[PDB]
Design a protein around this nucleic acid. Structure first.
Ligand SMILES: [Mg+2]
Ligand SMILES: [Mg+2]
Ligand SMILES: [Mg+2]
Ligand SMILES: [Mg+2]
Ligand SMILES: [Mg+2]
Ligand SMILES: [Mg+2]
Ligand SMILES: [Mg+2]
Ligand SMILES: [Mg+2]
Ligand SMILES: [Mg+2]
Ligand SMILES: [Mg+2]
Ligand SMILES: [Mg+2]
Ligand SMILES: [Mg+2]
Ligand SMILES: [Mg+2]
Ligand SMILES: [Mg+2]
Ligand SMILES: [Mg+2]
Ligand SMILES: [Mg+2]
Ligand SMILES: [Mg+2]
Ligand SMILES: [Mg+2]
Ligand SMILES: [Mg+2]
Ligand SMILES: [Mg+2]
Ligand SMILES: [Mg+2]
Ligand SMILES: [Mg+2]
Ligand SMILES: [Mg+2]
Ligand SMILES: [Mg+2]
Ligand SMILES: [Mg+2]
Ligand SMILES: [Mg+2]
Ligand SMILES: [Mg+2]
Ligand SMILES: [Mg+2]
Ligand SMILES: [Mg+2]
Ligand SMILES: [Mg+2]
Ligand SMILES: [Mg+2]
Ligand SMILES: [Mg+2]
Ligand SMILES: [Mg+2]
Ligand SMILES: [Mg+2]
Ligand SMILES: [Mg+2]
Ligand SMILES: [Mg+2]
Ligand SMILES: [Mg+2]
Ligand SMILES: [Mg+2]
Ligand SMILES: [Mg+2]
Ligand SMILES: [Mg+2]
Ligand SMILES: [Mg+2]
Ligand SMILES: [Mg+2]
Ligand SMILES: [Mg+2]
Ligand SMILES: [Mg+2]
Ligand SMILES: [Mg+2]
Ligand SMILES: [Mg+2]
Ligand SMILES: [Mg+2]
Ligand SMILES: [Mg+2]
Ligand SMILES: [Mg+2]
Ligand SMILES: [Mg+2]
Ligand SMILES: [Mg+2]
Ligand SMILES: [Mg+2]
Ligand SMILES: [Mg+2]
Ligand SMILES: [Mg+2]
Ligand SMILES: [Mg+2]
Ligand SMILES: [Mg+2]
Ligand SMILES: [Mg+2]
Ligand SMILES: [Mg+2]
Ligand SMILES: [Mg+2]
Ligand SMILES: [Mg+2]
Ligand SMILES: [Mg+2]
Ligand SMILES: [Mg+2]
Ligand SMILES: [Mg+2]
Ligand SMILES: [Mg+2]
Ligand SMILES: [Mg+2]
Ligand SMILES: [Mg+2]
Ligand SMILES: [Mg+2]
Ligand SMILES: [Mg+2]
Ligand SMILES: [Mg+2]
Ligand SMILES: [Mg+2]
Ligand SMILES: [Mg+2]
Ligand SMILES: [Mg+2]
Ligand SMILES: [Mg+2]
Ligand SMILES: [Mg+2]
Ligand SMILES: [Mg+2]
Ligand SMILES: [Mg+2]
Ligand SMILES: [Mg+2]
Ligand SMILES: [Mg+2]
Ligand SMILES: [Mg+2]
Ligand SMILES: [Mg+2]
Ligand SMILES: [Mg+2]
Ligand SMILES: [Mg+2]
Ligand SMILES: [Mg+2]
Ligand SMILES: [Mg+2]
Ligand SMILES: [Mg+2]
Ligand SMILES: [Mg+2]
Ligand SMILES: [Mg+2]
Ligand SMILES: [Mg+2]
Ligand SMILES: [Mg+2]
Ligand SMILES: [Mg+2]
Ligand SMILES: [Mg+2]
Ligand SMILES: [Mg+2]
Ligand SMILES: [Mg+2]
Ligand SMILES: [Mg+2]
Ligand SMILES: [Mg+2]
Ligand SMILES: [Mg+2]
Ligand SMILES: [Mg+2]
Ligand SMILES: [Mg+2]
Lengths: 135, 208
RNA sequence: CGGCCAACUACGUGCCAGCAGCCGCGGUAAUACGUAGGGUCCGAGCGUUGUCCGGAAUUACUGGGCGUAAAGAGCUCGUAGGUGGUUUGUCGCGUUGUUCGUGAAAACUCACAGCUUAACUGUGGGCGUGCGGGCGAUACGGGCAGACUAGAGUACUGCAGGGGAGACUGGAAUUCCUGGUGUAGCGGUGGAAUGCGCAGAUAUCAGGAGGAACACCGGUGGCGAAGGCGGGUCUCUGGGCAGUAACUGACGCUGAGGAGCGAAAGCGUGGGGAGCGAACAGGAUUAGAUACCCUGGUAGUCCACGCCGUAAACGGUGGGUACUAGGUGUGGGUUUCCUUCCUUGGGAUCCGUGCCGUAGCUAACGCAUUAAGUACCCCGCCUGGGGAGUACGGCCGCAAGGCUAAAACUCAAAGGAAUUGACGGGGGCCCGCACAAGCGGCGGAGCAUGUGGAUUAAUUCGAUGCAACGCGAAGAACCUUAC
RNA sequence: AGCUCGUGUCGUGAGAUGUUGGGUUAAGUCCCGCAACGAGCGCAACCCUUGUCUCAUGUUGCCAGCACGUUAUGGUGGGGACUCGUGAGAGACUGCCGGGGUCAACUCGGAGGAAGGUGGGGAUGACGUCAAGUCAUCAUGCCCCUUAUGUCCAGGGCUUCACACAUGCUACAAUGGCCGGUACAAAGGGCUGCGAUGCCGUGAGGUGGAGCGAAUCCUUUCAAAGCCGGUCUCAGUUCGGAUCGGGGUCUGCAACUCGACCCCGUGAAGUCGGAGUCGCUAGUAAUCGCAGAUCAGCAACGCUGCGGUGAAUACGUUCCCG
């Protein structure tokens, strides 16, 4: 949904907010809501919504990636730029309007057609599942 | 002027009085004796920084409380300094007085003690840079305290001009009356003149 | 012994006395002045001064640029010179192909050796980077001795165009004149008055006269080498583009000096002269206007013949050639195919002209096949800012003037792009008794205190717009009280 | 209401981003997309007072309901049923609805409610600027006097005055001055101080002195404007009070410069005001009183706060200042 600028490059900053989000989950699961004023209760619920909506993957990655896979690089230039800046290998779908040197292992296809996008994502997910069984 | 004393500002809610008694008849003499004894304590005792001075008085009895980082030199193992202080008190005729000595739990978390330490370092040879680096790091070593600022004004290094420089680290809500602000200041001595040191200490907040 | 630049403190005078190679150092508390110590460098020498090279790639052949900092001449034609599109043939004059043959001595560089080692010199080499003739080579780099054509030109058919010159001609508008009608104003600016009217203005109708220029089409469009070029019509003519490729078969390019064209203004002669409009009069504003504003209007603006030859003459970029990703419009011409064969239909091709963008270049803005990209050929221009595009001299011009183009002295900077504030009589969106609608006030007079200014032996001192002034003074016969 | 920082990215470098643009808010308040992610000083909130209700709760304070007063009134025996005062708690959070809104912030209208969209006012001054003010609050480096520029009183002047500016008071007169009658406040001070009742003074005040370290006693039962009655018929005036002289009180050793207050005569000046200029958008403006305070008197119309009577308008940013 949302790509935070340099979250992979600037990981020491977002590690603190992963700590904060885990702490907030732990405190919320306890059940303490009436101990705070309703104004800050509403504020914390809103920030739960915001951060949960904008942050999905760093909850589960923690230990930083080894490869980065991107769709529609001309709009997603930020991710691939950070990937080359950090030296992480890049695998992405290049359309007719994309720079070929940006992706280390290009995969020709369409980012604009849901059929092709879903099929390519399913193929790569099947490859990942096969590797996961193969460990 | 820029800012009023935070202690005076939040004196009504979060902080408490150091001197507590009631007088209508001779209150001028009560306060003049108080200020006289506090001046003599400040003049005589400089080796040991007196963090706080507190007195409570009923009728004739008066009980003075002295807070210091360490009591070893404030009160001797035999009591020479205590005897000298009692002698000064009876010379000003403070009638029957009982003294209490309390040592602080964290010397680096109190405004007056760190201010006196920085003042001594600046006075002898220590440069303001390294002095404030050491003070700030010793401050943030303690977990309880969160936000720190220290400021100095005057002639720094003997130059013929006035430098006003400060360092900030953490959260110090001056405007928030709930904030627990510990204020301290001292006037350091130097060959070229005098320099003032100003410090604010934030330590949590209170609800209720 | 401030930073450049290995070496700091105290004492003495403070915009004085003084230092200094660049920045630059003293306006009572100087590591920069003078003296002390202390340390640094060097040493029988130590510094100052002057000349020469280096850094200075700061005269750039190796090894610089010309968009804005210094520079593309205004642009063409073109002489002398410099440089050439393929392959078909000798001599070897640009040239390397090896050898013998000179390179005086001395010096430099290598090794040896002697003065005890030192300068000094003792011996033998080696070095002695250029030039002479005899013998042996032919790939490039030239003339010479023969053929073809990928540059160029011509030839056949079409093409669009404000390309240029002369002549003829059209309408609208302004002004003026003549004649009606028609009444007291018309013109003017932020406001008014000089201006024309009551002798008949303005307005309006009819007619005529004369001069300039062509509104729409008309555009970031066409042409020209560049200045520039547009009412039609005729007359003559240049340049450019596409296809067939018939023919010429090294004719190509740029071009120092030289010569021709050239915006506006200016000059001579002789005509023209409606509108516009330097100069000059008045009226207006301002303390002041010899300007901005208003009313008038003489050169000029028009024509013919000559002249001067300068513009921010800009794409601030010379021309020519070959190569290097695209997208979106316009103009001109050839073709082919959905094919109605109507259609900016679709495709191919060449030329011209706008916009945005890669890689790349650039200090940046930015350029980006119509390069500032990567190169080749030639030509002009620049070496810190003033002086100065000026004096003298030379050339042209009848003159105004134009071209060629210095030196002394002075400054230690002047300049190009870009970042951020501040300001704005630059703009948009917002705030407040800021205005608007308001009551009550002060500024006219008594009061009772405070402040400047003048007297006295003192009239203590401090605060002088916002943010001082019934302020410290929220209490003067002694005190306060400092004179 | 803006001011910054850590990581990252672009350029090479000053730097830039974050802090931009759209919507919204009193505000860097919030939301949308973006080489930004976040954090700090800010801003709002937390504090005091003020607006309501409930509980707790009756004396020196009030009196619903009972008795004694008999001219002096809760004055007296009695009581929390209310204010009175001070504790705890509750109550404004777009709480709910309709419409616009990117279905998001937010806005207008509507019901409840005391308040509606920070209810009102305060304390609360981010980085910095003016080398801003203060060596006469205090403390201090340097220089200067040390037999003086030190100390003490041989008294005086800080207040002198041909004139200007600055901020106030009282007015310029009838919405008034004066005279008589007459009802409502808050808060606060008092030990070498507040000072009752009483007597004498026009009145400053004098004798005398109860009650108080203080909801009690004194600051009068805290009043003034406010209401009724009478005069003035618009005059330099019954407005207006200075100036000067004549007589006393008060603090004090001693009132000439150089005090204040009380009494008399004193009768000048001035009729809403020149350009320009100030403050005020709800208890506000405007007007009338009281009190903290320094003090022994006093230049006390001042500063500060406590009160009383109490308006008008906002069509909107084109112009002036920030
Ligand atoms: Mg040195
Ligand atoms: Mg050195
Ligand atoms: Mg000195
Ligand atoms: Mg030495
Ligand atoms: Mg040299
Ligand atoms: Mg070369
Ligand atoms: Mg060069
Ligand atoms: Mg230039
Ligand atoms: Mg040029
Ligand atoms: Mg020229
Ligand atoms: Mg020739
Ligand atoms: Mg030969
Ligand atoms: Mg030979
Ligand atoms: Mg030879
Ligand atoms: Mg020889
Ligand atoms: Mg040599
Ligand atoms: Mg030998
Ligand atoms: Mg030799
Ligand atoms: Mg040589
Ligand atoms: Mg040749
Ligand atoms: Mg042939
Ligand atoms: Mg040909
Ligand atoms: Mg044509
Ligand atoms: Mg002609
Ligand atoms: Mg006529
Ligand atoms: Mg006419
Ligand atoms: Mg004419
Ligand atoms: Mg042929
Ligand atoms: Mg040619
Ligand atoms: Mg040529
Ligand atoms: Mg030529
Ligand atoms: Mg030439
Ligand atoms: Mg030439
Ligand atoms: Mg000619
Ligand atoms: Mg000619
Ligand atoms: Mg002309
Ligand atoms: Mg001309
Ligand atoms: Mg002339
Ligand atoms: Mg002529
Ligand atoms: Mg003529
Ligand atoms: Mg004219
Ligand atoms: Mg004119
Ligand atoms: Mg005339
Ligand atoms: Mg004139
Ligand atoms: Mg020129
Ligand atoms: Mg031109
Ligand atoms: Mg040219
Ligand atoms: Mg070329
Ligand atoms: Mg083309
Ligand atoms: Mg590139
Ligand atoms: Mg570059
Ligand atoms: Mg481009
Ligand atoms: Mg080109
Ligand atoms: Mg170039
Ligand atoms: Mg000059
Ligand atoms: Mg010149
Ligand atoms: Mg000459
Ligand atoms: Mg010339
Ligand atoms: Mg520039
Ligand atoms: Mg700029
Ligand atoms: Mg307002
Ligand atoms: Mg107004
Ligand atoms: Mg006034
Ligand atoms: Mg006045
Ligand atoms: Mg003074
Ligand atoms: Mg002033
Ligand atoms: Mg003021
Ligand atoms: Mg006053
Ligand atoms: Mg005075
Ligand atoms: Mg005295
Ligand atoms: Mg600001
Ligand atoms: Mg980088
Ligand atoms: Mg953002
Ligand atoms: Mg910002
Ligand atoms: Mg920014
Ligand atoms: Mg930006
Ligand atoms: Mg904002
Ligand atoms: Mg914030
Ligand atoms: Mg706040
Ligand atoms: Mg009752
Ligand atoms: Mg600030
Ligand atoms: Mg200052
Ligand atoms: Mg002084
Ligand atoms: Mg001091
Ligand atoms: Mg002193
Ligand atoms: Mg005096
Ligand atoms: Mg005095
Ligand atoms: Mg003033
Ligand atoms: Mg009166
Ligand atoms: Mg009365
Ligand atoms: Mg009454
Ligand atoms: Mg009496
Ligand atoms: Mg009177
Ligand atoms: Mg008058
Ligand atoms: Mg009158
Ligand atoms: Mg007026
Ligand atoms: Mg009044
Ligand atoms: Mg007093």
């Amino acid at each position: 949904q949302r790509w935070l600028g340099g979250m992979l490059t600037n990981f020491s900053t977002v590690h603190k907010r992963l700590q904060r989000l885990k702490e907030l989950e732990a405190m919320e699961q306890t059940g303490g809501f009436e101990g705070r004023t309703k104004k800050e209760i509403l504020m914390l619920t809103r920030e739960k919504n915001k951060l949960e909506r904008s942050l999905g993957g760093i909850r589960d990655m923690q230990k930083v990636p080894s490869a980065v896979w991107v769709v529609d690089t001309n709009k997603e230039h930020i991710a691939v730029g950070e990937a080359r800046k950090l030296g992480i290998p890049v695998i992405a779908i290049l359309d007719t309007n994309c720079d070929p040197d940006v992706v280390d292992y290009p995969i020709p296809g369409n980012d604009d057609a849901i059929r092709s996008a879903a099929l390519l994502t399913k193929v790569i997910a099947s490859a990942v599942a096969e590797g996961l069984q193969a460990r | 002027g820029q800012k009023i004393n935070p202690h005076g500002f939040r004196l009504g809610i979060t902080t408490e009085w150091k001197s507590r008694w009631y007088a209508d008849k001779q209150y001028k003499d009560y306060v003049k004796e108080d200020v006289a004894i506090r001046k003599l304590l400040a003049t005589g005792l400089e080796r040991a920084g007196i963090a706080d001075v507190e007195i409570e008085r009923t009728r004739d009895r008066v009980r003075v409380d002295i807070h210091t980082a360490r009591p070893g030199i404030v009160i001797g193992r035999r009591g020479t300094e205590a005897d000298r202080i009692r002698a000064d008190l009876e010379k000003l005729t403070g009638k029957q007085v009982q003294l209490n000595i309390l040592e602080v739990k964290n010397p680096e978390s109190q405004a007056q003690l760190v201010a006196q330490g920085v003042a001594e370092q600046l006075s002898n040879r220590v440069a303001f840079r390294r002095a404030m680096r050491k003070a700030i790091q010793s401050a943030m070593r303690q977990p309880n305290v969160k936000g720190i600022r220290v400021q100095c004004s005057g002639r720094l290094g003997g130059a013929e001009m006035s430098r006003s420089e400060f360092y900030r680290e953490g959260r110090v809500p001056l405007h928030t009356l709930r904030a627990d602000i510990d204020y301290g200041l001292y006037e350091a001595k130097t060959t070229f003149g005098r320099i003032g040191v100003k410090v604010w200490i934030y330590k949590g907040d209170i609800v209720g």
